[PDB]
Amino acid sequence: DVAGLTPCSESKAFAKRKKNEVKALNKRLKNYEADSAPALALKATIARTEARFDKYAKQGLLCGTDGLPHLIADPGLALRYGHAGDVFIPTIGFIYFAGWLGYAGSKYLQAVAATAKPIEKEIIIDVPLAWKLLWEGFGWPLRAFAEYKNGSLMEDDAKITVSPR
Amino acid sequence: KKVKIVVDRNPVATNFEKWAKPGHFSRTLSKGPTTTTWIWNLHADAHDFDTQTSDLEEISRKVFSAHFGQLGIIF
Amino acid sequence: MPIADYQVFTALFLALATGIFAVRLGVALYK
Amino acid sequence: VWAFSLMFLFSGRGYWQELIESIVWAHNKLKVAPAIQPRALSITQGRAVGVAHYLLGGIATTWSFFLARILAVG
Amino acid sequence: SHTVKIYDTCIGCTQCVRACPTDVLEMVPWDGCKANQIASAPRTEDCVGCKRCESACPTDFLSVRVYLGSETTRSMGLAY
Amino acid sequence: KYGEESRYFDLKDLENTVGSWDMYGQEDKSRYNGLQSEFFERAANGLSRREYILGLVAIGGAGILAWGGKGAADVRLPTVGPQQPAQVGPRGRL
Amino acid sequence: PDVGPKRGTQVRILRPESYWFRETGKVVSVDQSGIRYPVVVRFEKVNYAGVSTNNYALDEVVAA
Amino acid sequence: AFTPPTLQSDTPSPIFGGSTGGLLSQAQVEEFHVITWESKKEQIFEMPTGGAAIMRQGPNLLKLARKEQCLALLTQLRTKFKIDGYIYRVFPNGEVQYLHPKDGVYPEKVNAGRSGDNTNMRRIGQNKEPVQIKFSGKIPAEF
Amino acid sequence: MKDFTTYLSTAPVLTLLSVTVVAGLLIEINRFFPDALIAAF
Amino acid sequence: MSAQFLPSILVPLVGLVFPAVAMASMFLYIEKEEI
């Protein structure tokens, strides 16, 4: 109970929603024979729905007035109440992966900028170099922090074009 | 005069060397993409055979083979 | 108790007077 | 998509070019400037993109409406 | 009645004069550039404002600057 | 014009070369018969001045306002007729 | 004596109104006749008009 | 010195069938331009008003609504036919003003003896700020 | 096959193959790990 | 509502009479040549 929300393990409307979904899928079932391919497909869909609802009740999600999971996007409020996987852990995951992709692209730009024809290397991508830099970009946070402390990550303003005010 | 089949034996070689270089068909697309406008113009003038060659024969041959490719896509 | 005819007519005359004031201000602004 | 067309149909190239200049400054500050210079879409490019998105959005809206209505009732 | 001005960055390539469709610009002798010629605009009353001269100027930034101003029957390009 | 051959410009006859023509306007004194011309010029005598033809528009606008004063109701028109009960509304209103 | 930067050197543009303001350019030729903008500077980066060379004066160009 | 050529009014016109893009009401009460050129053979050219016309051997005379149409015809004669021409400004009162090849040679070639007006001796960025010319009826570039 | 591999290294071929492999990886992730609302470890 | 006749006169006045007179007056004034 972090903001007037109840856990979906004990909230009644979550179970009501699960029952309604399973009942609708059973209403879909009650038209085919037991061993037909549509019957197997609907049975798989039912199993997936029950597994999803049981997993959501297991993971400790919060449900509001009705049975819909709510996520917490405050560190501390999610850390001490055990919901860091709602926003905080995916925040760290996205920051890592986006930094990996962006650092790989950046290093490709600075690697092909000092070649004979940097114009050609951006439509005709050197695949081994791109693969190597994509691998090297997995250590993007340490490399980026090192280049920031070295001062080689940013460019001086006196070497950057601006408009004449 | 006299309707008959006339063709040219082996006009264009079959290889992948022009696949490596985009914008080969038009002279204005040469010397690389200095801007992204080059990238847009490359697709803009891909089928504009009048801007690629001045010969009606080459334009007609390109149109015929493009028709064959479209028929293959439809099939 | 709704207002009378004389009140409406007096209000309309005073609006005519302030319209004269308005056109005087407009002429002064144009000059 | 139809309302996305309204960006290209109503605006003009100079605004987007100047905004791209500011973004290019941001890229220059972090040494991530592409060698292929990013330019705003040309005026004919902008008109073509706008009309393509407009017709795509309108036709697909009508297609989804027609098919859903005629497959739900009939 | 469009203000057309020429500036000293002109290199005398005569492209602005060739681009003009109403004969506004012409080349006059000059000593500030290698080509020994600069552009001039003696007939700005015939200028429509098409800015074809600006599209032909290779100098960065351009030397033939057109300022759209008062509109007449010739600046508006009317045939009626 | 001096267009006896293919010469469609002439400074001494610049009237015809420019394109100023009558197209269909022709000069003729004879058109309307007798007495009726005097009748119509007497009907439209002093009204030809700009101020009096303005005053005709003034009395026309006076007629426009006279319709609203007494004339709209003479042709019934629903905006000045009576009313028949009323409606309450969504909730307890009026 | 020759005036301006030497031919083929690396120069920075100080004209704040130019496209390549405070950028990298190479001197192609410097005219000694008395041109108002004798320094010819070529850039790898083209402008909106598509040109990659421009003429500049003396005080709006520093080397290196 | 150079003298302008006189507009020989009795000059033959190119063969043409009659267009809708020709002269209008502006010619009678403001102005209409005219172009004169010398052709070495009978050949077909394109009218600025639409359609094809045949200019004849020798002198050819064509009047047009605007100066831009006259220069379009002159530049297509100069490119596709290598034929020079003269353009005149004709007022309805009768006065004729010589126009495009004003000093004999074309404006893209120097003549040494022209007026170099509208040529500022400063750069683009050396104009005055608009606040320093505030309430004047002039743009910063014409100071 | 140098020219063929250069064509395969061209920007559209590489971006289509890259979005294809990324989309396929994400699709198989959702196939084996469906309905992952949160990063519950 | 007191004086019911007054809208019946004023509405045509500000809908026909005053607008027609104002439009005619402004059309005359915009092409007065020598004011």
Ligand code: CLA
């Ligand atoms: C890997 C290349 C790369 C990198 C490192 C950056 C980095 C940056 N961009 Mg940029 N951008 C890129 C490509 C890149 N961009 C491309 C291709 C486009 C055209 C669609 C843009 C359009 C763009 C705009 C309009 C803006 C930025 C902005 C920014 C800054 C804000 C952070 C951000 O992520 O914004 C968001 C970035 C995007 C929305 C574009 C991401 C597109 C993909 C994911 C990147 C390209 C991947 C590349 C091909 C990988 C190559 C791998 C290599 C081994 C070959 C940041 C420094 C913003 C800014 O100026 O901040 C101040 C801003 O306004 N970018």
Ligand code: CLA
């Ligand atoms: C038999 C049919 C046919 C053929 C052979 C041509 C052939 C040609 N056309 Mg044309 N045209 C056609 C029909 C046809 N057209 C129709 C039906 C229209 C009305 C829309 C047009 C309107 C048109 C215009 C306005 C222009 C041409 C032009 C051209 C020439 C160059 C084409 C080019 O390379 O540009 C590039 C082609 C492309 C970049 C293909 C992409 C075009 C759009 C984006 C595809 C639409 C998206 C598609 C529906 C997928 C949507 C789903 C999406 C979410 C993935 C070329 C000779 C151009 C020209 O200059 O003529 C000389 C010119 O500008 N056409």
Ligand code: CLA
């Ligand atoms: C539905 C209509 C619509 C939409 C979606 C947008 C969207 C946008 N406008 Mg815009 N605008 C509109 C109407 C619209 N406008 C109209 C009518 C006008 C008046 C002319 C303007 C005028 C205007 C101005 C002046 C500016 C913007 C700006 C922006 C961008 C703001 C950044 C942002 O919010 O990121 C959100 C990104 C999106 C909403 C794009 C959708 C995400 C896509 C679909 C993901 C791609 C997936 C897939 C690959 C799609 C391709 C499919 C294909 C390959 C088959 C954004 C892309 C500003 C800007 O450029 O920001 C820097 C800017 O300055 N707009």
Ligand code: CLA
């Ligand atoms: C700006 C305020 C304002 C507005 C928007 C209206 C609007 C309206 N009035 Mg009303 N009126 C107003 C002020 C206003 N009045 C005042 C202060 C009085 C007290 C004298 C009246 C007395 C009045 C009467 C007696 C009647 C109306 C009526 C009406 C309706 C039809 C117009 C008409 O025929 O009457 C003409 C209106 C007048 C002769 C006086 C209005 C003078 C206002 C203040 C002019 C303001 C102009 C504004 C500041 C600038 C706009 C530019 C303009 C000068 C071109 C109409 C909805 C009629 C009605 O009830 O319809 C059913 C009706 O008979 N009004």
Ligand SMILES: CC1=C(/C=C/C(C)=C/C=C/C(C)=C/C=C/C=C(C)/C=C/C=C(C)/C=C/C2=C(C)C(=O)CCC2(C)C)C(C)(C)CCC1
């Ligand atoms: C005597 C009388 C009669 C006549 C009565 C009349 C005739 C009454 C008329 C009433 C009217 C019709 C009043 C109209 C008033 C108009 C007003 C109050 C408008 C004010 C506008 C304002 C304040 C703003 C003006 C603005 C400014 C500031 C500018 O400078 C320019 C822009 C603009 C917006 C215009 C009759 C014979 C019947 C019966 C006998 C008695």
Ligand SMILES: CC1=C(C/C=C(\C)CCC[C@H](C)CCC[C@H](C)CCCC(C)C)C(=O)c2ccccc2C1=O
């Ligand atoms: C937004 C906008 C721009 C800016 C548009 C730009 C910079 C183009 C953006 C394209 C980006 C770089 C690629 C995005 C790729 C998408 C993921 C998918 C695009 C679809 C392709 C596959 C065709 C203009 O240049 C413009 C010009 C004239 C009138 C209106 C406008 C206008 O509205």
Ligand code: SF4
């Ligand atoms: S195009 Fe520019 S540089 Fe060339 S002559 Fe004209 S003004 Fe001078």
